[PDB]
Point group: T
C-alpha cells in the first residue's frame, strides 16, 4: 500500500557527472517530498572547444506518494 512515483529528470553540469546528478536532485528537493532513490538511464553531453561543455545525466527519481 506504499506507492511510489518515478519522474524522469535530466541534470546538467559543466563540472562533471556527480554534479549533474546533484543538480537534478537539488531541483527535485525543492518541490517534491520523500525522495528515496534514483537510477541513471543515460549519460550524454554537448561538445565545445575545450572538450565537454555540458554533462547531461538522464535519471529516474523515485519518491513515496503521500496517501489519500
Amino acid at each position: 500500500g506504499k506507492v511510489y512515483k518515478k519522474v524522469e529528470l535530466v541534470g546538467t553540469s559543466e563540472e562533471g557527472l556527480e554534479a549533474a546528478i546533484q543538480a537534478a536532485l537539488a531541483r527535485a528537493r525543492k518541490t517534491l517530498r520523500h525522495l528515496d532513490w534514483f537510477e541513471v538511464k543515460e549519460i550524454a553531453g554537448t561538445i565545445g572547444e575545450a572538450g565537454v561543455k555540458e554533462y547531461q545525466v538522464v535519471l529516474e527519481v523515485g519518491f513515496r506518494l503521500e496517501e489519500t
Copy 2:
C-alpha cells in the same frame, strides 16, 4: 485527436504481485481520471526472515488527457 499520458508508478504489497499492482492502481484512481491501461516494467522485492517481505511492481499507467 486523443492524447494520453503515461506515468510511472511502483506498487508494493506483502501479499503478492497482483496486490502490488492493485495498490498502484488504487492510488492512481484517487486523483487521476480516465485510467485506461497499464504495463508492467519490472518485478522486484525486498527479503526478510520469512522470504519475500515486500513485492514491488514498477508499472506505467496510461490515461486519456482531458481538454483545456
Copy 3:
C-alpha cells in the same frame, strides 16, 4: 534433429496472472500437440472502476513439430 515452433499468444483473465497464462495454454492445447514450454514476454492489463479489469499476459509457447 528435432525442430520446434514458437507462437505468440496473449492470455487474459480477470482473476490473476496465473489465470491469464493458463487460459492461453488451455486454448493452445485444443488444437496444438507436443506443447513443451512457455516464456512470458510482457504483462499488461486494462483498468476499470475496481482497479484491474483484465490481466493480459503475452507469452511465447514452444512446441515440437511433427515431421
Copy 4:
C-alpha cells in the same frame, strides 16, 4: 546547471505518424513552456475495416524547468 524534465505522452491520429506526433506536441504546448525536444519510443495502432484506424506514437517530451 539547467534541469530538464521528460514526460511520456501518446499522440494519436487517423491521418498518419507525423500528425500523431503533432497532436501530442500541440497538447503539450497548451500548458507546458520551454518544450525543447522529443524522442519516439513506440509506434503502434488500432485496426479497422479500412486498415489503420488510429496511429499511436509514444513519445518522451523534454522541456526546461523554470527556477524557483
Copy 5:
C-alpha cells in the same frame, strides 16, 4: 478467457511508411478475422539510385482467436 494471437508481418512500399504498414494490414485482412491492433518493431529499407527504393516495416499484428 479471450485469447489473442500475434503474427509477425513485414509490409513494404515504395511510397512511404504508412503505405508499408497499410500493405501488411491489407494482406492480413484478406485471411484473418478480428484484427485488433499492431505494433511496429523495426523500420528499414533498400536503397537505389533515387534514394529509398523500398520502405520495409516489421510489425506484429494482434487478433482475437475464435472458439
Copy 6:
C-alpha cells in the same frame, strides 16, 4: 564501503509465481546471510496435460558481503 553480491537463481513451483520466487529465496536463505533484495529477470515454465506443469522464475538475489 558496503559491497553486495548478486547471484542468479531459478525458483520453480507447480503452485504459482509467488511460490516459485519463495522457493528460490528459501533455498538461498539456508546458506547465505544478509539477503536484502531480489529482481525478477524472466518468467517461463513447462506445459503438461493440465496446462502449466511448472512455473519457473529466474531472479537475481542481492546480499551484503561480510568483511
Copy 7:
C-alpha cells in the same frame, strides 16, 4: 506491394550451430514456399556427460506471402 511473414522456429542438432540452423530451414522448406531470409535470435543448448548434448538455435524465418 509485397508482404512477408516471419515465423519463429527452433532448430536443434548434436553436431553444431550450422547444423541446427539447417535443420530448422530444412523443415521449413517442406511446407513453406518463398523462404527468403533468417535471423538468429538466441543460441542455447543442453548439457550432458560429453559437454554439449544439443545445440539449439532460435531463428526468425522470413518468407514472401502469396496472393489469393
Copy 8:
C-alpha cells in the same frame, strides 16, 4: 566473402520522417558507392512554436565495400 560497412547518419527535415531519411541518403549518395540498405534506429526531433520544428531520424546505412 563480400563485406559491407555500416555508417550511422542522422537525417533532418522540417517536412516529415520520409524527408529526413531521404536527406541522409541523398548526402550519403554524394560520396559513397553501392549503398544497399538502411535501418532506422531512433526517431527524435526539436520543438518550436508550431509543434515539430525538425524531424531527426538516426539511421544505419549499409554499403558494399570495394576491394
Copy 9:
C-alpha cells in the same frame, strides 16, 4: 520444489565457436554437478595477424542445486 543456479562463464578457443562453448562446459563439468542447459549471451573475440586469434563466447550455465 527444485532450484537452479546460473553462473556466467566465458569460454575461449582459437578453433571456433563450438570449441569455445565446449571449453566452458568442460571446465564447469570438473567441479559442478547436474549441469542442465546453457544460454549464449555474447560472442566476441581478439584479432591478430591471421584474423581471429581467439573466439570468446559468454554463456550462462544452469544447473540443479542439490539438497
Copy 10:
C-alpha cells in the same frame, strides 16, 4: 580454453561513482585472483537531505579461472 568467470557485484560509496567501483574491486581483490576487467551495468543511488546519500554501481567483474 582459458575460461573466465564473471560475478556480479554492487559497489557503494558516499563520495562518488569512481569510489563505488573501486570499493567493489577492492573487495573482489581480497579473495579473487587474476581479476582482468569489469563492466558497469547500472548506476543508481539513495537520496538523503543533502542529495545523493549513496552511489551504488552494479558491475560485472571478469577473472581468469585457474586450473585444476
Copy 11:
C-alpha cells in the same frame, strides 16, 4: 591516454559463421592497423534451395587510433 574506434562491418560467406567473421576481419586488415578485438552484434542469412545460401555476421571491430 589511448583512444580506440569501433567500425561496424558485415561479413558474409557461404561456408559458415566463422568464415563470415574471418572475411570481415580479412577486409579490415587490408586498410586498418592495430585491430584489437571484435564483437558480434547480429547473425542472419539468406535462404536458397539448399538451405543457407549466405551467412551474414554483423560485427563491431575495435582498433587503436594512431597519433
Copy 12:
C-alpha cells in the same frame, strides 16, 4: 535539412570517467569539425593491483556534416 554523422569512439584514462570521455573528445577535436554532442554507451575498464587500472568509456560522437 542538415545531416549529422555519429562515430563510435572509446576513450581511456587512469584518472577517472570524465577524463576518459575528455580524451575521446580531445582526439575527435583534432581532425573532426562541428562536434555537437555525445552519448555514453558502455562503461568498462581493466583491473590491476591497485584496483581500476584503466577506465574505458564507449561513446558515440555526433557532428554536423559539411555541405559537401
